[PDB]
Amino acid sequence: MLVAKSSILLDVKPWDDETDMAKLEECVRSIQADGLVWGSSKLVPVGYGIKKLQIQCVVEDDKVGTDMLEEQITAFEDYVQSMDVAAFNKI
């Protein structure tokens, strides 16, 4: 833990291949907050066409919660099929 920070990996499923991943992957990043750090995202293909919307973030221990990020990322019901959690621990 650098300085009172943590790592939380999120995983969201796109409605379909139509779901502009570039936007989903971007929007996710675009999202900004106080003490909110955006790390590198990951991809996980289920079988071409569609892919997983996995991304990593670095919150401040318990300062920046996923609640917001979720309400922001999953705020798009026209892209996010169903958000979930990949884990919850420090960075």
Swiss-Prot record:
PTMs per UniProt: Phosphorylation affects the GDP/GTP exchange rate.
Stimuli inducing this protein: By homocysteine (HC), may mediate accelerated synthesis of free thiol-containing proteins in response to HC-induced oxidative stress.
Chain residue numbers at which the record places covalent cross-link Glycyl lysine isopeptide (Lys-Gly) (interchain with G-Cter in SUMO2): 13
TM annotation in the entry: none
Summary of the function given for this chain in its UniProt record: Catalytic subunit of the guanine nucleotide exchange factor (GEF) (eEF1B subcomplex) of the eukaryotic elongation factor 1 complex (eEF1). Stimulates the exchange of GDP for GTP on elongation factor 1A (eEF1A), probably by displacing GDP from the nucleotide binding pocket in eEF1A.
Subunit relationships: EF-1 is composed of 4 subunits: alpha, beta (alpha subunit of the eEF1B subcomplex), delta (beta subunit of the eEF1B subcomplex), and gamma (gamma subunit of the eEF1B subcomplex). Interacts with elongation factor EEF1A1.
Protein name listed in UniProt: Elongation factor 1-beta
Lineage: Eukaryota, Metazoa, Chordata, Craniata, Vertebrata
The encoding gene: EEF1B2
Residues of the full protein shown: 136 to 225 of 225
